[PDB]
Amino acid sequence: IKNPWEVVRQSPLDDRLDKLDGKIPRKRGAMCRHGPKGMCDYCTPLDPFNPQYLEEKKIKYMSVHAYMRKINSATNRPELGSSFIPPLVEPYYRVKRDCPSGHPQWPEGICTKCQPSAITLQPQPFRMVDHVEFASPQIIDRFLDAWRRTGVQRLGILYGRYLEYDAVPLGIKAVVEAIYEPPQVDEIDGITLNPWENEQEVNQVAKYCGLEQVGVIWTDLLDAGKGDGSVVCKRHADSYFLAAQEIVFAARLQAQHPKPSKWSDTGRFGSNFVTCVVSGNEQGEISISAYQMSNDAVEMVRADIIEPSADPTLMLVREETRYIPEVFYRKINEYGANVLENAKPAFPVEYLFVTLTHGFPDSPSPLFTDNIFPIENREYVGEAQEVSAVAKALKVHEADAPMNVSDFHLLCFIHQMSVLSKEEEALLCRVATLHDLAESFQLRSTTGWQTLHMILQSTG
Amino acid sequence: NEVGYDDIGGCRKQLAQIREMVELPLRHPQLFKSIGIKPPRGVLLYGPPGTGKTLMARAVANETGAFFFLINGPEIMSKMAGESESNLRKAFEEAEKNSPAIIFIDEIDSIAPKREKTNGEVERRVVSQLLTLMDGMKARSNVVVMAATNRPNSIDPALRRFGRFDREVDIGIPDPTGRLEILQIHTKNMKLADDV
Amino acid sequence: NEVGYDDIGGCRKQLAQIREMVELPLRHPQLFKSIGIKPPRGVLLYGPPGTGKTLMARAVANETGAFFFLINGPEIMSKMAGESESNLRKAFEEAEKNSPAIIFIDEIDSIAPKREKTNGEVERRVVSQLLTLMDGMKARSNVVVMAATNRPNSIDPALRRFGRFDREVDIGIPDPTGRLEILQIHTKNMKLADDVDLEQIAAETHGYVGSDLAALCSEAAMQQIREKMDLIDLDEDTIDAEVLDSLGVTMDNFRYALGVSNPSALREVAVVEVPNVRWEDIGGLEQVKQELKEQVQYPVDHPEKFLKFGLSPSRGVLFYGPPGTGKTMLAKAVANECAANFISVKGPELLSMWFGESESNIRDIFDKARAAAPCVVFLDELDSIAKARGGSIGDAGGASDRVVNQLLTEMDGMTSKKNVFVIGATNRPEQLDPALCRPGRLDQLIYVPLPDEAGRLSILKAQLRKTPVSKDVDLAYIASKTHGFSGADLAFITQRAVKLAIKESIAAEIEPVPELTKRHFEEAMRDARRSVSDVEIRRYEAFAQQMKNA
Amino acid sequence: NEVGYDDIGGCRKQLAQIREMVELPLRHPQLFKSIGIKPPRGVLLYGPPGTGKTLMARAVANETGAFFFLINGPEIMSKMAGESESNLRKAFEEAEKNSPAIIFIDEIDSIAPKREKTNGEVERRVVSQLLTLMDGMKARSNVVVMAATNRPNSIDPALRRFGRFDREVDIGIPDPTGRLEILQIHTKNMKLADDVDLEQIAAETHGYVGSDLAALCSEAAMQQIREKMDLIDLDEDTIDAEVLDSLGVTMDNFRYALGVSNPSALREVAVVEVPNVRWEDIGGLEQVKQELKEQVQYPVDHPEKFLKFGLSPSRGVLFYGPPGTGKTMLAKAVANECAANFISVKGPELLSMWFGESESNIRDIFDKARAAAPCVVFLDELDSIAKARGGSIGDAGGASDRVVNQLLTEMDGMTSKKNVFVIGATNRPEQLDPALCRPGRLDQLIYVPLPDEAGRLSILKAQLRKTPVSKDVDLAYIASKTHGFSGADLAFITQRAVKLAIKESIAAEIEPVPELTKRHFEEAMRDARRSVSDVEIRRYEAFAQQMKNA
Numbered sequence A: 001i002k003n004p005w006e007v008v009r010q011s012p013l014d015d016r017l018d019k020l021d022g023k024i025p026r027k028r029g030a031m032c033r034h035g036p037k038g039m040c041d042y043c044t045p046l047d048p049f050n051p052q053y054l055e056e057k058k059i060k061y062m063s064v065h066a067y068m069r070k071i072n073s074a075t076n077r078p079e080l081g082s083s084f085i086p087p088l089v090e091p092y093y094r095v096k097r098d099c100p101s102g103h104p105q106w107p108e109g110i111c112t113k114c115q116p117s118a119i120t121l122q123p124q125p126f127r128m129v130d131h132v133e134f135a136s137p138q139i140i141d142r143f144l145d146a147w148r149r150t151g152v153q154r155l156g157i158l159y160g161r162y163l164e165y166d167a168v169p170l171g172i173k174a175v176v177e178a179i180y181e182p183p184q185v186d187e188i189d190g191i192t193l194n195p196w197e198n199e200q201e202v203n204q205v206a207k208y209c210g211l212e213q214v215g216v217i218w219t220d221l222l223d224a225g226k227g228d229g230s231v232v233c234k235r236h237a238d239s240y241f242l243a244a245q246e247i248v249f250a251a252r253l254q255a256q257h258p259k260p261s262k263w264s265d266t267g268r269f270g271s272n273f274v275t276c277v278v279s280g281n282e283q284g285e286i287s288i289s290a291y292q293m294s295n296d297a298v299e300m301v302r303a304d305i306i307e308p309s310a311d312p313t314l315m316l317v318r319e320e321t322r323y324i325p326e327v328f329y330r331k332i333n334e335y336g337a338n339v340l341e342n343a344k345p346a347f348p349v350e351y352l353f354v355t356l357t358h359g360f361p362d363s364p365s366p367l368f369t370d371n372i373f374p375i376e377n378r379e380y381v382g383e384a385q386e387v388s389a390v391a392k393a394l395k396v397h398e399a400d401a402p403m404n405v406s407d408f409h410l411l412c413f414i415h416q417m418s419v420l421s422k423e424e425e426a427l428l429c430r431v432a433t434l435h436d437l438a439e440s441f442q443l444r445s446t447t448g449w450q451t452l453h454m455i456l457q458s459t460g
Numbered sequence B: 001n002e003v004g005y006d007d008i009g010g011c012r013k014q015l016a017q018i019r020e021m022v023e024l025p026l027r028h029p030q031l032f033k034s035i036g037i038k039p040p041r042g043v044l045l046y047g048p049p050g051t052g053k054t055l056m057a058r059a060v061a062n063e064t065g066a067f068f069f070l071i072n073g074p075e076i077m078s079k080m081a082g083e084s085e086s087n088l089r090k091a092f093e094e095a096e097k098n099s100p101a102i103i104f105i106d107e108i109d110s111i112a113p114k115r116e117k118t119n120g121e122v123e124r125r126v127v128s129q130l131l132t133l134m135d136g137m138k139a140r141s142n143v144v145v146m147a148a149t150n151r152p153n154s155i156d157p158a159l160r161r162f163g164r165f166d167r168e169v170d171i172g173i174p175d176p177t178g179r180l181e182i183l184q185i186h187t188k189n190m191k192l193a194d195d196v
Numbered sequence C, D: 001n002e003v004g005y006d007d008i009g010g011c012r013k014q015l016a017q018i019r020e021m022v023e024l025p026l027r028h029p030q031l032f033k034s035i036g037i038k039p040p041r042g043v044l045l046y047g048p049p050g051t052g053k054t055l056m057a058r059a060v061a062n063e064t065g066a067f068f069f070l071i072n073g074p075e076i077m078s079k080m081a082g083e084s085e086s087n088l089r090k091a092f093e094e095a096e097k098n099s100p101a102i103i104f105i106d107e108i109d110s111i112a113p114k115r116e117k118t119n120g121e122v123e124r125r126v127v128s129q130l131l132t133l134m135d136g137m138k139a140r141s142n143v144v145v146m147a148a149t150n151r152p153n154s155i156d157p158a159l160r161r162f163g164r165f166d167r168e169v170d171i172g173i174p175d176p177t178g179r180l181e182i183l184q185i186h187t188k189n190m191k192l193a194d195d196v197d198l199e200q201i202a203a204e205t206h207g208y209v210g211s212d213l214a215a216l217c218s219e220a221a222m223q224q225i226r227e228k229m230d231l232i233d234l235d236e237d238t239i240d241a242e243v244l245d246s247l248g249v250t251m252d253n254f255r256y257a258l259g260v261s262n263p264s265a266l267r268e269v270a271v272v273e274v275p276n277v278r279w280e281d282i283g284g285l286e287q288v289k290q291e292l293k294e295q296v297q298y299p300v301d302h303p304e305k306f307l308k309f310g311l312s313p314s315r316g317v318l319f320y321g322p323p324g325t326g327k328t329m330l331a332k333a334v335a336n337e338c339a340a341n342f343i344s345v346k347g348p349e350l351l352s353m354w355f356g357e358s359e360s361n362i363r364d365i366f367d368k369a370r371a372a373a374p375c376v377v378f379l380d381e382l383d384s385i386a387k388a389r390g391g392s393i394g395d396a397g398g399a400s401d402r403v404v405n406q407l408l409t410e411m412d413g414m415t416s417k418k419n420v421f422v423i424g425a426t427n428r429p430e431q432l433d434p435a436l437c438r439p440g441r442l443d444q445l446i447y448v449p450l451p452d453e454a455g456r457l458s459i460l461k462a463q464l465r466k467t468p469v470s471k472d473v474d475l476a477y478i479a480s481k482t483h484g485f486s487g488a489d490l491a492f493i494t495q496r497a498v499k500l501a502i503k504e505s506i507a508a509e510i511e512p513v514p515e516l517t518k519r520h521f522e523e524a525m526r527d528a529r530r531s532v533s534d535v536e537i538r539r540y541e542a543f544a545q546q547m548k549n550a
């Protein structure tokens, strides 16, 4: 039957991004030997993957689409349908199953036709998302209220959508709207989760709101003890950037969130799921470092290969079911040479992440404008989820007052109340995200929101 | 610095060929469309060195209303690995964009020696890049590839096979009649005495 | 741009092979499943360059209902290191996914040279990638690998070994019958005039590939346009349609195009080609005619008497005699009789291909004749092999050199069961070693004498079959006066006499005589000169008396 | 797809070796532990290509209870740099984990060429990776390394040294007995007709490998389908089962399949093969028959008298005489008597393999004969070695060249204890240097005269053993009239007479006579011609009187 890339379906953004070359058109350059409708070696339009263009624009890696249009010819294109080669290959560092050479499975049998290859941890030449647009500082300033009251760290989940980021060519931006937090037992240097219980529920809110789990955020905010918000400069050049337990644990969640792709052999490639670490700069102000594991770093967690050390910069190679061949990493020495060092038993963790930029809009107009809810799983600071706030939050005993539901924490609490049905809550999350007046007037005339009135006109 | 037909002289029979080969399919592709044959996209120039082979390129190219793209031999070979083959792909996409197009390549043997008589695989890639991209063209593109050399034998003959380069055009040494014309080209800018 | 069976023509026997090799396992894999044999997955195409080898791929591929993949030689070699070998792995996984699959690889030698004769290990990896992935296939995959080249010898032979590529399929140069069909393929799209006789063209074209013929069709089209260039102004942006309707290619455009810069095709190789001369075109020598009817026609027609009699024949025939006695045409006329294939090899053709060192082709002469059995292999100018070292006197080196030592192996490396035949011909038979004259190698020795006056009559009858001769011509009175003159001498007289006739013909055209007068003859008869000394004949007649003393 | 002992056949002696080398240390390592020797971990397979070398690996490997690991040659060479050498380290750790282990490496020369003759250091690393990891093994590991190639000379010899690879195991070309078994392996899966005589096929196939025979079985299957193509429509999606049941391959399909191109074998190497001619098939010359019964049959049958007498024999026998005296068949019939192995080497076979420079094979001629002791090495056409420089007159260069200087080393590099024997034969014995005729090298010199009329009687009796001759044939009256005629001449007369019979046989067929009449003979008897001058004989008789003056 068909290919996966003949049955999988891209995102609408991936539908938007395919119809563009992303080519950067030069005008008549230096060594033009032509009239103005001629060309020379120096007035061609440019590439999205052009390294001199990425160097002058200080752009670290090309986008995954700029990677896509680099590695593939234009003719090899899925609108052919049947005759299409997916240029992307999701890594398969597990074990060649169903081996066609007479020997048993991987277990009990091995030959050359079933073994995977030894890993060359180069830097990944591309990344998925380039910019991390936090849609409001009030998204953050709400979120960092737990740390200012306690001082211990905080984990969250990035919600939102992926849009075009036009500053870099073919840039995808992680527009961030919302954060939900599962039950968890919080400590200082590490965090261990409790299992998340309403897994279909909060995901249904994003399905209502038109959001999804677009990534993960957590914090590394250790106040440096001078009372301003300065940190111990701990995530920088000399120390490290990513804790290696954070790398594996995010790659656990990143394996839980791949992205379907019409350009890859499984019909899926990479991951929409991204990673952010809130920290502090050298200047003593609350900064953010955004990353994502490489497609090897996902696979070596999927194929159970690497392991953290006591040194956060060193990553251990696991000793011996499975198959652990060489790992390398290409270097640049002090005269530019590329030396693949033996990564057994340990190696730098540099070759596993990609760097991302991060920021804000010029003026905050997110899909959420309201902030009225005490955050879940904080009964250790007395910040709980009770029904009694809705008399002041949605203002239902003050029955004239308009709709303050523009709050994802509260929208999940309304979804925790689970009163509005699947069409009326998608009429709520219609009005909770778009705020139409005649549709608020429709929702204030719907039965279930008037049921949500008349139930909460009789509470205390 | 911009070359017309008058700026070249003497090799009239050769220019009679190229106008049939280059000027003719571009300003009238309908003729090959009406007669139902394929336009030759394999124009090859060759001759002794320093014989106007680069000069006759723009002498045709500037006398079209067609788009022109220029490729130098050593300019691609000056480039680094991989990036040099990128520019060839950047060449033909612009020509297949601006479909009335002329691609002249000066000193084709520098990017295309014999694959038997060569050492670097980077040379072997850029030959293999060229052999690929010549065949990737279309008749609906209406794009003409010109190439010139002074060593027609040093080329990989797979280019000189059918579909890629068929039109072997030699530029011979001119007669005293034609080289008289060539002197008049250079001296009409000069300031002479009447004894000349 | 999408190719059916009708778009290719002429090489019907070759397409008969490939349909048995490619069309047959795909639309009916049950046949090999019912008979219980393995389907061959090693289809290899080869031939001269520009012979439809890429064309016949899609001619099969588009005429299946099978998923047809594709891989160009230089396209993989254009790619960077490691990534090029990735695409081959990306190739076969898609074919083993879409299990009725065709994998054609054009220009297989570019990704697979000899591993002994190569420099880059990247070339050595992609060969090693190919050798691996060919063996990784399965019979349950039902996936056919096609490959084409123009240099079958430059390939690493590990591909041409068993399991990887077994089906050597050559695409030969077509006959004038088949190339007539090829002209009809290209001209049926063209707009012609009614004078166009492709059959006249196909007779006049002898060693052309279809690429030469397609260039031949493209050339006469341009001269047709050259005739219209007076009516066509290039500064106009669109010419009118009236000259387009009158644009019909004449027969004379092909007569222009016949002597064009396209005629020079690729006939500088070891070719196989059916001849055209017959027994009527060689006058006299009916004794050695029947001797060839004995020695070479009886095995190619009836091997049944041999197994009846338990005796393998003598496969080695040597022609000898004085020079200029038509010994070249003798092997052609007998291959034209019993319809065997024919390979003409001259003396310096061995040497000039060995200044470039083409000696696998010398083996491939025997292999292609084994591939084109029944075939006769004709070795013209065996004195030139002696003249590689000057002679048997020579530069003190005899006939024996690297050529003989190669040929004695390859002549002895022939199975006696094979009807593949070897015909040797020289004019200096003393000057050849008896090691080549050894029984088993070349034991039949045939003297070619001069004809008598009756033979000289029969030659002049046979030579003048296509000439508008006069009616007063007493060829017997010519045959009376021509005594010591060879058959080459008689044709040389006619070349003089026709030149004497043109010294009357266009001489009169400058001041139609389509007749060759006695006055044209008696001038050349007075100017007639013998080319062979009789004392040279007394050597050969002593060899004709006895050369078996050697 | 999983191979037992029954799936391979014919090479029983070779499988007898490997079971001693591979099966024996694994299922009983205690035997080498009890006797206190080291198990050989250096099993090396080699032979011609396509000879079941990959097949015999799993034929042993699947018939153990041992772990097996597989390595392909090009699969490692397909890999990238560093990672390819990783897989070898990943190979042996698994084998030293699962300690009863078999490591077979197919096409070992691709990962191990000569380090002198190679370019990439990546090739030089993976050789150096292999040389390291072979020595890193242990005897307590009980892990056997198998390796196969078709080019045993292209390997770096450091592998073939001690501790790494000691067990050189050649897989020779099978006899007609063993290849009969190979046909039964492939055809027992096939569906045949009752006319099929594999024994008739196996007699008619002489130099084929099993790959040639498997292609031979696959070819006649297709012609059987070609006969059914009229009953099979390819536009149908499934043919009916009635033609499948009638699809039974005929004997004549193999008769078709014997004359096709499959039958091009791989015979162009230095081969060892038992002969077929015997003493009855060579008429006359019983004196030198007994001389060979003295000189070469007594050592191969009884070395016990030599150590009784303290004397090593003369190992060097030179045949000489006039040409065409059956000297080629003489060494074949004596190797067929005492069942010694036989290696036929002709003159230009040395030279043509030295235009490609195969001289380790010339040493390997002696090595394989040492491997196949008892064996006789036959050097046909020793004049051709002189004719490499033209002769002893020649191009002023005598018999001595690079060939002789190689052979004089290799002939002297033979242990006198070895029963490996060297047989030389020429027809121009004056034209050979006495350095090759030196005692210790070639000191026995045997003149081969022409037979008498009684010998010519015995030849014509022996030559006509398989011919349906007439009853009126007085061979003695032929032997009376044939006096100066060689044994080659007598066979040449029969080739004429059979041709004269076919000039009656198929002449009558177009106008069964299975008889060779006196009328067939007295024409050829009148046409009979002597090939040897008696003045040439007076040379040889003076050499037969005395050549020891040299």
Ligand SMILES: Nc1ncnc2c1ncn2[C@@H]1O[C@H](COP(=O)(O)OP(=O)(O)OP(O)(O)=S)[C@@H](O)[C@H]1O
Residues within 6 Å of the ligand: B007, B008, B009, B010, B048, B049, B050, B051, B052, B053, B054, B055, B107, B148, B149, B150, B182, B185
């Ligand atoms: N026939 C000519 N008529 C006019 N100018 C000429 C002629 N031949 C040469 N020239 C001049 O000499 C120059 C030769 O430059 P090129 O054409 O680049 O040399 P080439 O003929 O291309 O051969 P190369 O460059 O050595 S491979 C031209 O650019 C003109 O300036």
Ligand SMILES: Nc1ncnc2c1ncn2[C@@H]1O[C@H](COP(=O)(O)OP(=O)(O)OP(O)(O)=S)[C@@H](O)[C@H]1O
Residues within 6 Å of the ligand: B161, B162, C007, C008, C009, C010, C048, C049, C050, C051, C052, C053, C054, C055, C056, C107, C148, C149, C150, C182, C185, C209, C210, C211, C214
């Ligand atoms: N027998 C033929 N019949 C019809 N067209 C032919 C024939 N031979 C050649 N041509 C034409 O000539 C072109 C040459 O392409 P191919 O012959 O297929 O290339 P090739 O045969 O692989 O030889 P190469 O590419 O030089 S190795 C074909 O595409 C046809 O257009």
Ligand SMILES: Nc1ncnc2c1ncn2[C@@H]1O[C@H](COP(=O)(O)OP(=O)(O)OP(O)(O)=S)[C@@H](O)[C@H]1O
Residues within 6 Å of the ligand: C281, C282, C283, C284, C322, C323, C324, C325, C326, C327, C328, C329, C427, C451, C459, C486, C487, C488, C489, C491
């Ligand atoms: N008996 C003959 N019958 C017909 N044509 C002949 C005869 N003898 C010679 N010729 C012609 O003369 C030429 C001799 O042909 P060839 O075989 O090439 O000559 P040859 O006898 O082989 O000796 P050389 O050394 O090659 S010229 C050819 O053009 C023949 O057509």
Ligand SMILES: Nc1ncnc2c1ncn2[C@@H]1O[C@H](COP(=O)(O)OP(=O)(O)OP(O)(O)=S)[C@@H](O)[C@H]1O
Residues within 6 Å of the ligand: C161, C162, C163, D007, D008, D009, D010, D011, D048, D049, D050, D051, D052, D053, D054, D055, D056, D107, D148, D149, D150, D182, D185, D209, D210, D211, D214
């Ligand atoms: N003695 C034999 N008995 C039965 N089948 C045989 C024999 N020799 C060859 N074959 C067949 O021929 C096929 C060819 O594969 P192999 O001969 O094993 O290859 P090889 O002999 O190892 O030489 P290569 O593969 O070219 S290195 C085998 O798979 C068998 O089907």
Ligand SMILES: Nc1ncnc2c1ncn2[C@@H]1O[C@H](COP(=O)(O)OP(=O)(O)OP(O)(O)=S)[C@@H](O)[C@H]1O
Residues within 6 Å of the ligand: C438, C439, D281, D282, D283, D284, D285, D322, D323, D324, D325, D326, D327, D328, D329, D427, D451, D459, D462, D486, D487, D488, D489, D491
């Ligand atoms: N004594 C003999 N008995 C039987 N056949 C013989 C005898 N002598 C010669 N022949 C035949 O002679 C023919 C040729 O034999 P050869 O072995 O070729 O002669 P030779 O002595 O080896 O010299 P050359 O150089 O090989 S021709 C064969 O058909 C043999 O059957």
Ligand SMILES: [Mg+2]
Residues within 6 Å of the ligand: B050, B053, B054, B106, B107, B148
């Ligand atoms: Mg130039």
Ligand SMILES: [Mg+2]
Residues within 6 Å of the ligand: C050, C053, C054, C106, C107
């Ligand atoms: Mg081609």
Ligand SMILES: [Mg+2]
Residues within 6 Å of the ligand: C324, C326, C327, C328
């Ligand atoms: Mg001749």
Ligand SMILES: [Mg+2]
Residues within 6 Å of the ligand: D050, D053, D054, D055, D106, D107, D148
């Ligand atoms: Mg093998």
Ligand SMILES: [Mg+2]
Residues within 6 Å of the ligand: D326, D327, D328, D329
């Ligand atoms: Mg002999």
Ligand SMILES: [Zn+2]
Residues within 6 Å of the ligand: A028, A029, A030, A031, A032, A033, A034, A038, A039, A040, A041, A042, A043, A044
């Ligand atoms: Zn420009």
Ligand SMILES: [Zn+2]
Residues within 6 Å of the ligand: A096, A099, A100, A101, A103, A110, A111, A112, A113, A114, A115
């Ligand atoms: Zn495997």
